[PDB]
Amino acid sequence: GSSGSSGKTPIQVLHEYGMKTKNIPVYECERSDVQIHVPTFTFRVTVGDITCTGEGTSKKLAKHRAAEAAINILKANASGPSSG
């Protein structure tokens, strides 16, 4: 067994990956509500054909979720259109 577990962040993997698929994950704020110390920023992630959004928190979490979504999909969905 290999002692020394490790894990890459959803913001590093997704993005870093987008580079391979000549497609970088865009992050835009759809809705921004400021009422308390920690506002809510909805970051929309668009990778190739997959489009997700992370609403609930600010760049802090909102971002993490935004990138997290795509990834999870990039694994199952395995985006990859073939030829005829």
**Domain boundaries along the sequence of the chain:** 7-84
DSSP the chain: ---------HHHHHHHHHHHTT---EEEEEEEE-SSSS-EEEEEEEETTEEEEE-SS-TTHHHHHHHHHHHHHHHHT-------
Structure-determination approach: NMR
Question: Residue 69: left (phi > 0), alpha (psi -120 to 50), or beta?
Answer: alpha
Q: Which fold has domain 7-84?
A: Double Stranded RNA Binding Domain (3.30.160)
